[PDB]
Design a protein around this ligand. Structure first.
Ligand SMILES: Cc1cc(Nc2ncc(C)c(N3CC(CC#N)(N4CCN(C)CC4)C3)n2)sn1
Ligand SMILES: Cc1cc(Nc2ncc(C)c(N3CC(CC#N)(N4CCN(C)CC4)C3)n2)sn1
Lengths: 282, 279
């Protein structure tokens, strides 16, 4: 489906990053305010533009209940290139949980967790490494469905290798990053699983700022970079604490996702089953 | 009977305005082999406080139950009157939960909640109003048992009334009618138990404490005046993060403005047992 810029009407800024922005837009070829509300991603260089084109190919290739729906592209055009997606009105799982936590029980968190795993399992089947797995990059469609909503750092594994080594000088979500992603820049399914452990931690802490990954890691750390301190803390088996009231089996899952050894981390297929089972037992 | 000369001070456990509890060895062989006990005494021994303490001692002596700290005896030496109790080594549920939260699940909280209800149900049968139900006044015997550990404010209901009118107070634990009229009842005990439940499911987090939350809702008049207005306007403590639906619902029913619409301790015990069984 083709989108003409002249019919793309700006409603509201949803989120701004270092290198991106997402906007709420109405696509209104009848210019009568009846056009479909959509989400529009665009840049704020030629490197970032090569990467964005890759990001667009990646999401176009994905069709799944738990991945934000690709709708199309909108060109003036490369400087003005926009990626058009469905608009999910409840926004990020991060803001939704912050807003609505007093109505979200353990059962509901486990439903969301399971859908994250299935979205991530499907990414696995394409050999795509997300590298940014966090509740801020998960959208709420409704009370009963979440989707992975951003692929801004996602990479394709080389054909004959199980990891992608990234050489980028930009800021990184280090408190979500596996030891081997920090030390060697190696991203894999296993570094995705590490990141998922912290998503689990995010959900069961109900994203309270006092218990956030940055807050907890900085408390354990106490003349070297924060990155050096984090690496040394993780090497020494420093880990995020058990969230208050987190069930035994969900903490055990967190702890296994945060194995120093890449090869000893659970699969997304195994994680989905264990989470479904913990949920069934409640 | 306990002789002061054999009561050997080990450590201060806690202090209030008018009394103190100490860890002591009772050692009549003075060889360091005597049994460790808990010893309560008055900070100021006025005649009135001493009459009250004698009442407090009779109250605990009358209580024989798995979920009430064991009375062991008294120390005369009358000005220097001491109450001797068992020493529970894990201390208050408040300090235990603060320390050990990372090893305590919802199932364990519900076990403790159930045992508090049974201790409170039994107080019921004697017509005793506790008036100080809080995790700081619950002791941990071991991983699998808690007890009500203090009866410093407890009253006996008059013969012909279902309430006692008592003319600093733990106001953030106090039922509206305790704040406005000083009326204590089993229903004000239930109100207070709601806040104990709230304490447990917030894992004694300072950021989520009753004082912290109530003062956040409030913001030239007393905190007590603002609290009464907030409670009359149906202001209430929020649902603790991940508190199960049925445990929040129980909290909310304990905090009914109407005394007569609060659950019984017998009903609370059954509902909490059942929520625990269903998990
Ligand atoms: C109020 C509200 C609703 C939102 N709905 C929405 N519907 C679709 C997408 C694609 C989307 N977004 C925000 C997103 C995060 C995710 N997933 N961006 C990524 C880029 N970041 C720089 C900012 C956040 C993609 N939001 S958002 N809020
Ligand atoms: C670490 C530890 C061990 C303790 N064990 C204990 N064993 C018996 C009693 C009676 C007791 N205590 C302290 C208590 C708290 C309650 N319930 N008092 C209530 C009166 N408050 C003014 C001060 C604290 C009764 N503690 S205590 N700590």
């Amino acid at each position: 489906t083709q989108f003409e810029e002249r019919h793309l009407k700006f409603l509201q800024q949803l989120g701004k990053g270092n290198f991106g922005s997402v906007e709420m837009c109405r696509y209104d070829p009848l210019q009568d305010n009846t056009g479909e509300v959509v989400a529009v991603k665009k840049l704020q260089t030629e490197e970032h533009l090569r990467d964005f084109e890759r990001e667009i190919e990646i999401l176009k290739s994905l069709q799944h209940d738990n991945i934000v729906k690709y709708k199309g592209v909108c060109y003036s055009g490369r400087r003005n290139l926009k990626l058009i997606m469905e608009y999910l009105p409840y926004g990020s799982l991060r803001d939704y949980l912050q807003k609505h936590k007093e109505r979200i029980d353990h059962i509901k968190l486990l439903q969301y967790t399971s859908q994250i795993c299935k979205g991530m399992e499907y990414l696995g089947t394409k050999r795509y490494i997300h590298r940014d797995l966090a509740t801020r990059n998960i959208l709420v469609e409704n009370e009963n469905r979440v989707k992975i909503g951003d692929f801004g750092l996602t990479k394709v594994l080389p054909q004959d290798k199980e990891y992608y080594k990234v050489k980028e000088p930009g800021e990184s979500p280090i408190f979500w990053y596996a030891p081997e992603s920090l030390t060697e820049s190696k991203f894999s399914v296993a570094s995705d699983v590490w990141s998922f452990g912290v998503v689990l931690y995010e959900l069961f802490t109900y994203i309270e700022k006092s218990k956030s990954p940055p807050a907890e890691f900085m408390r354990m750390i106490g003349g070297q970079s924060i990155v050096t301190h984090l690496i040394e803390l993780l090497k020494n088996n420093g880990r995020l604490p058990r969230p208050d009231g987190c069930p035994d089996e969900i903490y055990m899952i967190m702890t296994e996702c945060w194995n120093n050894n890449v090869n000893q981390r659970p699969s997304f297929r195994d994680l989905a089953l264990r989470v479904d089972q913990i949920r069934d037992n409640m």
